[PDB]
């Protein structure tokens, strides 16, 4: 079923904000790509995978937000007798372009925190494999459930509201498992981290947890607020969540990765 | 409410100038991106964050101006019985694509001046955090106010002119606070700068202040001149302001960052 | 004859999944391009051709999936009285954009496995030449056969179902020959590989074989399931197959190439 | 007023040549960007600014020609009952997209010749500032004058032919001043150039002068030849002029910059 | 006159093959650009110009094939009552987008063979200048002649078939001269090449000659086969010719350039 966005009309500002947010995020991510590409070398090689992952996540995110921007532009047009942007006939907006890209982002983001905790080899591979499984299942179960949002919002003639709940609850179980895997890594860092590194890893985990927590809220929004102001708020919190979870987290984790690099005597890391 | 631009028609030249300006700026910024990417290494590592920020700002700005270019092309079409470019039916131009990207640019630009003053660590982080707060509030308050510009221009049937003023005045308070934070950094540079560096930092601040000051003028233009010639002038001063605030400032600040690099004996900085 | 996709209508979700998959894959490949570009140097020079090939394959794949994404968007439009995406009049979707790009990917992927087995010079060239011949013939014979899929699916008025079979069976003969060439290389690796390298090469071959095997299934799908749910499943298995055969295989083969690099004392490979 | 191009119809070949020229130039400049990016390091650091400028100019030029290509495609369509490309209703072509980008190119091109003459510091800055002033005024005065070209061509109902002349003549005064600034730099090179360097700098100046001289001709063309064959010739000479002034000049000036690099003992410059 | 392509209709497969070929070639060239950019450094500096030229040619070729792809998509649309792709009203396809880009490719390709033969300085410059003159004249004379192809094919109402012949024959004279210049360079290589290098240079020349020879055939095709199957064959042989002449030749010439690099003791060339 089409997203709740398609069943509304928009004031100039409601539509215009959302197109600005989609455009802002594409730029943040492309700018982040340039920054992570330009600064990766400064990390020691045994942490440089984390640096590289951040560039990969930026590409993924930039295309995710760019496609949403395009589809948002395509899917509505102004009507001057209504003074509203209104759905165009041949096109329907999907908030689910974003889910599929999360299949890249989510396991990568969790993986780079584990890389900086200092896991290597089989132990990195094992943790990567659990997080990827846990991640893909969270995301796929959520993607199914968001196909039922016109139903949960009570748009006449759409049925299957229960499906929204079931798929969300299953999804959230997979979320908890990922948080348990990562909580176990940051509590058990490898390579004799300092107590400062020890602390910065814990902060990275709670930052991860706080920012990832917004996404389940944005999921449930059609239930609370299925209106054009709700759509505006939902796209605002997705934007806060994307920039934090991906770019701000990447900069924070880069700072820990540099401290570890320098503590093990990487000279590029020390000169800065 | 749609921007004042949408309530006018344009002579060939009025429209054509504006599309040229949008296109010119996109090119300046992409060219600036190449230049900052090609010259960053020449800066010492303890100032290279400034170099990197300039590349980030260039990406941000290039996409900001590119989207405006696209929307400007989309939003109007020629009419030969009027010999004017006139608003197309399904699309409305927004001068507010630019505001959202300022959320990247403004705190970054101020941050790179602080990096070159020589702040590091917690002291950099603290200043970055104040400038980001001050910056986002200036920009968000201004963004609200520019949604009221058809009202302030007296386009029949648009109300809320007072909202233009209130949101502008609040915005300007946040501007003053940012200028106070930066004034305190350039007056208190770190790392035993030379008296030449000391002077060049002060010039960077006043350049920043002069160029940033144009933006509040472009804001108030619908009040002074809500006409197609006014729209032309407004887009000319935004263009002067963007190129100065972002690219020319970046080159100037790079020159200070190099002088500091060389004074601390960075050899790449000395060989040039 | 146009692909079976053109003879169906789609529910919102059927269409929307497929456009998400095409978009997801383009992003995976562009992100993979960044990753392979950023990590190639870490491989020793005598294996760096493999690293370079992975970047080449990523470009090829990203454009292949991007074209499909574009054509998928162009080829159908929503109809609200049918609540379906339906074929647009002037455009027809082709699943065969993907075949032509395989002419790059398939011989390159097989070549980089041979490079890492340690063949060099004439022996690399000979094997490259056999695999390229075998590969192009497999792909060209398959491309002919997929022009007959409306016929094999029993779309009224389309004839030549037998042509689907003949061209598929011929294609599969060329597949077997490529698998025989590669099986001979991984069983006869060069340069005194360790027993761990020896094992990792064999795993690379079976991974290659498993993932390449999905493609002949996706070929035969119009025969089993010529429905919109079948089209959905087919595009899901192509997506699993593309990401595995190209990106995941590239990361796995990079790990072997690094182990070999380090065993021969490449210092960048050892520091990580 | 719209450019003279808009008042004509085109044979297949007239239109097709022009779209080919616009496309050819975009490619030359993008290819030039790759070349200047790949070869900049070979120059000594004290001349590397020249190398960098060439990359900047290439980006600028590629976007200038790309936008003209796009607008040329947008602005006309084929009509089979006339067998002509003819102006589309909603769009008008502007030859003035190119002027605005010259604001980047012209002062940069002149600046890089001064860099290679060996000016540095204040003396470079002073000369850059004079050339930028002289350049912007030449270009802005010319841009005004080209808004009067339908008038000078005698398209019925367009007045202000005199404005074409006045703005052209003013523009040309600013041209002469730039040529005087540059003539003074190449006659007074810095850093004890060889007599070969001394000669190569003079050739660079006369090459600059010859190629820049074509642009004032292309300006005056509506006066001589306001026909579709004239439009073809004008776009041919702009293309010769762009490739020469920007790319060929950049390669020539790079050869001088390398000779100077090698004479001062830059080893990368000597090994090649 | 419009190309012969415009006077035909296409079966699904005829059209679909051609759009696949245009798309395949764009990808090969972009992938080739990445490969040549990633491997240039491995060549010794005195041969690195050849490496750089290959990247330049790849950019040129990628845009040439991309524009043809776009125009091919734009110029025809499906008609279900004819089951054919048929010319759209407002657009006409030109096979001559490709000619203009040859102005870059042809003299560059010939130049890089001369660079690897070991010519330098004035002797390189002289040969570059002859090949560029010879090349531009071959290409411009051919470009004129291909404007007469509807005439030579006997499309009713198109006259000037003789012009096809005259311009082709003139063009071919310029071809012979280029082949004579290059034949003289590969027979007289510089820098005491080995007998293996001596042989590999001769093979490069005959490869060049064979692949360049296809282009005059594709020219003459409207004479032999002015049908949709002919158009298919012509675009197949252009595709074989482009990939061979540009990418495969570049890889072959890179192998010679590396052998020469290593023989003169370039260590990066020896380690691989
Ligand atoms: C559209 C993007 C535009 C970017 C173009 C920037 C180049 C413009 C330069 C104008 C000349 C101003 O004056 C001159 O500026 C350059 C560049 O900062 C300075 O150049 C300095 O940095 C460059 C680049 O890191 C070094 O190669 C150079 O050796 C060094 O001196 C000169 O010391 C200064 O005297
Ligand atoms: C949108 C793209 C992202 C832009 C990134 C902007 C980063 C700057 C904002 C944060 C500033 C406050 O926090 C500051 O962050 C920078 C960058 O992480 C840190 O900087 C650290 O990494 C950079 C980059 O590898 C080094 O050049 C620097 O010497 C080092 O200290 C500072 O030690 C920290 O105090
Ligand atoms: C579409 C993009 C082009 C992709 C290019 C892929 C080509 C490789 C497959 C062909 C293999 C044929 O034979 C092989 O070619 C490669 C590439 O020139 C050569 O490779 C040579 O250059 C590469 C790159 O500079 C070096 O890392 C390598 O060590 C060196 O030997 C081999 O010595 C040769 O035996
Ligand atoms: C779409 C982008 C695809 C790339 C994304 C990243 C993929 C990696 C995910 C981690 C997989 C777990 O397995 C892990 O893989 C990485 C990358 O191959 C390996 O990493 C190895 O190569 C990288 C890059 O050359 C080195 O910085 C690292 O030190 C080295 O060990 C680990 O040794 C392995 O245990
Ligand atoms: C399409 C955009 C890009 C086109 C660039 C192609 C350049 C082609 C050059 C044609 C040959 C002319 O003559 C030749 O030029 C090249 C390039 O400047 C010079 O080459 C010089 O610079 C290059 C690149 O920095 C060095 O690798 C080379 O060793 C050095 O000699 C030759 O010394 C000169 O004799
Ligand atoms: C049409 C103009 C094209 C300009 C593209 C500019 C891209 C700049 C990218 C460079 C920044 C990243 C470099 C990473 C360093 C390793
Ligand atoms: C898609 C899900 C990916 C699962 C990854 C499983 C890895 C198994 C061990 C390595
Ligand atoms: C027309 C009413 C149908 C509502 C059901 C939609 C079901 C959504 C299923 C999505 C599955 C996608 C899985 C990813 C591959
Ligand atoms: C204990 C550590 C707490 C860290 C919480 C950070 C939350 C950041 C929110 C960003 C939107
Ligand atoms: C130290 C912690 C820093 C937290 C920074 C959070 C930044 C939030 C980004 C929101 C961007 C969206 C704006 C609409
Ligand atoms: C058709 C594709 C052409 C792509 C051109 C991309 C731009 C290349 C310039 C890259 C600049 C690199 C700067 C970083 C150097 C360190
Ligand atoms: C990032 C979120 C910013 C939201 C801005 C809200 C703008 C409000 C403008 C309301 C004007 C309404 C006028 C009547 C219609
Ligand atoms: C003393 C400081 C003087 C700085 C003035 C800079 C003005 C720049 C204007 C650009 C528009
Ligand atoms: C101290 C040097 C000051 C340089 C200021 C340059 C101002 C550039 C303005 C941008 C050009 C816009 C043209 C319309
Ligand atoms: C508006 C465009 C700005 C962003 C361009 C994309 C930049 C990509 C940078 C990736 C560089 C890869 C690093 C290669 C290392 C050798
Ligand atoms: C060394 C012989 C090369 C054989 C031809 C390679 C395959 C070409 C297929 C097209
Ligand atoms: C690269 C050449 C590919 C040629 C493919 C030919 C496909 C033939 C299909 C024709 C059958 C349809 C009959 C109508
Ligand atoms: C879709 C990915 C499937 C990978 C298959 C695993 C490879 C087989 C490993 C066993 C070889 C012994
Ligand atoms: C031991 C091998 C471990 C790697 C296999 C895991 C990756 C295979 C699956 C990747 C394809 C995912 C595509 C998602 C589509 C929904
Ligand atoms: C599908 C998109 C693929 C993008 C390919 C872009 C390739 C850019 C090549 C950059 C080469 C120049 C960098 C040289 C700097 C040293
Ligand atoms: C001394 C510096 C003076 C700079 C003048 C720059 C003029 C820019 C014109 C726009
Ligand atoms: C940047 C400044 C550009 C100013 C250009 C002004 C051109 C004026 C042309 C007017 C011609 C007559 C118009 C009749 C509608
Ligand atoms: C004495 C110097 C003579 C140089 C002339 C160069 C002319 C270049 C023409 C390009 C068009
Ligand atoms: C004296 C140095 C060599 C001069 C070369 C001049 C090259 C002119 C470039 C013209 C390209 C445009 C072709 C259009 C047809
Ligand atoms: C010198 C080595 C050259 C390496 C070229 C790397 C090219 C990478 C280009 C990637 C572009 C990604 C853009 C992301 C779009 C969202
Ligand atoms: C770069 C300049 C190329 C000029 C090409 C001229 C082509 C002439 C073809 C005209 C013949 C057809 C006449 C039909 C009316
Ligand atoms: C002895 C020289 C033989 C070279 C022949 C090369 C033919 C290549 C064909 C590519 C198509
Ligand atoms: C000596 C090696 C010869 C290799 C020739 C390769 C020919 C490739 C061109 C064809 C590309 C596919 C077209 C279908």
């Amino acid at each position: 079923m089409p997203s709740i966005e398609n069943f509304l009309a928009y004031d100039f500002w409601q539509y215009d904000v959302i197109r600005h947010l989609f455009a802002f995020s594409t730029a943040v991510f492309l700018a982040g790509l340039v920054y992570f590409a330009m600064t990766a070398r400064t990390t020691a090689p045994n942490y440089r995978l984390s640096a590289n992952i951040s560039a990969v996540v930026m590409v993924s995110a930039a295309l995710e937000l760019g496609q949403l921007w395009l589809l948002w532009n395509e899917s509505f047009q102004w009507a001057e007798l209504q003074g509203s942007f209104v759905p165009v006939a041949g096109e329907r907006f999907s908030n689910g372009y974003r889910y599929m890209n999360w299949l890249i982002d989510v396991p990568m983001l969790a993986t780079q925190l584990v890389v900086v905790c200092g896991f290597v080899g089989t132990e990195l591979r094992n943790r990567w494999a659990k997080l990827t499984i846990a991640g893909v299942l969270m995301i796929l179960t959520g993607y199914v459930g968001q196909y039922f949002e016109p139903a949960v919002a009570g748009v006449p003639g759409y049925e299957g509201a229960e499906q929204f709940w079931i798929w969300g609850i299953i999804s959230t179980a997979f979320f908890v498992w990922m948080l348990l895997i990562l909580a176990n890594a940051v509590r058990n860092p490898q390579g004799a981290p300092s107590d400062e590194v020890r602390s910065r890893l814990k902060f990275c985990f709670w930052f991860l947890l706080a920012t990832w927590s917004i996404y389940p809220f944005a999921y449930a929004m059609p239930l609370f607020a299925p209106t054009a102001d709700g759509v505006v708020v939902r796209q605002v919190i997705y934007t806060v969540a994307d920039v934090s979870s991906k770019l701000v987290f990447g900069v924070i984790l880069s700072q820990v990765a540099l401290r570890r690099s320098a503590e093990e005597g990487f000279e590029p890391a020390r000169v800065a």
Side-chain angles (χ1 to χ4, degrees), chain A residues 1-40 42-122 124-129 131-195 197-272:
Chain A
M1 302 162 221
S3 51
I4 199 50
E5 284 78 10
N6 291 281
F7 298 85
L8 308 160
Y10 297 95
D11 286 343
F12 179 78
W13 65 268
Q14 286 168 328
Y15 188 76
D16 195 42
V17 164
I18 290 161
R19 64 177 175 197
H20 294 169
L21 291 166
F22 288 144
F24 160 77
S25 308
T26 304
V28 168
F29 294 126
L30 279 173
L33 170 57
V34 166
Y35 178 80
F36 288 124
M38 277 175 87
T39 59
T42 312
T43 301
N46 65 308
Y47 296 109
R48 205 167 304 155
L49 170 57
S50 179
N52 292 342
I53 284 164
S54 283
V56 155
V57 166
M58 292 302 105
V59 169
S60 157
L63 289 174
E64 139 199 336
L65 265 312
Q67 64 209 17
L68 277 175
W69 177 75
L70 230 205
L71 183 58
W72 185 259
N73 293 330
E74 292 164 6
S75 292
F76 303 85
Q77 62 177 354
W78 180 248
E80 190 59 77
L81 272 316
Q82 305 182 58
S84 274
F85 287 91
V86 305
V88 312
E91 184 58 290
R92 288 280 168 284
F93 179 73
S94 187
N95 184 63
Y97 258 116
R98 81 201 313 158
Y99 278 60
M100 207 72 110
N101 276 57
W102 293 354
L103 294 166
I104 306 170
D105 304 325
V106 152
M108 288 294 83
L109 283 170
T111 300
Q112 61 174 347
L113 172 58
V114 179
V115 165
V116 176
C117 298
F119 293 96
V120 285
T122 255
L124 178 69
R125 203 207 50 235
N126 296 347
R127 285 166 176 70
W128 167 77
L131 286 168
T132 302
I133 292 159
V136 167
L137 290 171
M138 175 178 90
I139 287 159
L140 292 182
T141 57
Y143 186 57
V144 179
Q146 62 80 37
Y147 279 115
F148 290 93
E149 89 182 25
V152 84
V155 169
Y158 285 105
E159 308 311 306
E162 57 280 357
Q163 294 286 331
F164 192 72
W165 293 80
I166 292 157
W167 290 103
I169 288 155
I170 294 165
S171 180
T172 303
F174 291 107
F175 185 41
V176 170
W177 185 20
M178 284 189 90
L179 292 168
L180 292 172
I181 298 163
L182 281 170
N184 191 40
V186 306
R187 282 186 300 194
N188 291 117
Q190 310 278 115
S194 328
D195 290 358
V197 160
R198 277 173 171 290
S199 292
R200 295 233 275 162
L201 293 167
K202 285 170 195 268
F203 170 83
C204 291
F205 169 83
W206 290 113
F207 189 94
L208 176 323
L209 187 142
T211 55
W212 285 29
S213 291
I214 303 161
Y215 287 100
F217 283 95
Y219 180 90
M221 193 77 66
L223 167 70
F224 321 135
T227 61
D229 294 86
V231 172
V232 174
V233 171
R234 186 203 216 174
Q235 301 294 334
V236 173
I237 74 191
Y238 281 126
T239 301
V240 166
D242 294 339
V243 169
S244 303
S245 68
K246 298 188 235 266
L247 186 276
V248 177
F249 178 80
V251 176
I252 288 167
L253 190 64
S254 70
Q255 288 176 6
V256 187
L258 255 226
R259 178 69 179 288
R260 296 208 76 174
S261 301
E263 288 177 0
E264 68 176 36
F266 190 57
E267 210 57 46
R270 294 169 156 288
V271 301

